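Reagents: none. Just compute today. Monellin chain B,Monellin chain A.
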Amino acid sequence: MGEWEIIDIGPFTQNLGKFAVDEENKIGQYGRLTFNKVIRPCMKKTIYENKGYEYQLYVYASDKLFRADISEDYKTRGRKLLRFNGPVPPP
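Predicted 3D structure written out:
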């Protein structure tokens, strides 16, 4: 447990980007954002296999680049946006 990996940027990961954007738009500090895409590198920490995971993402939204931190409850499939900041310099 506790392993950090660099993971794919496929549909699971792109959907983490949409979640982050959808969650932040309900807050509104960053305006009304349009999800564009998630870019490499996407990092994932295994807090405990099949139970807890954490993600660090670079996400493009309304043509600006942001960094988001997302937790995931593997059993409920529920997610929480812990952090959304930017614009950030590219990786």
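The longest strand covers residues 35-48.
Action item: order primers for follow-up constructs.
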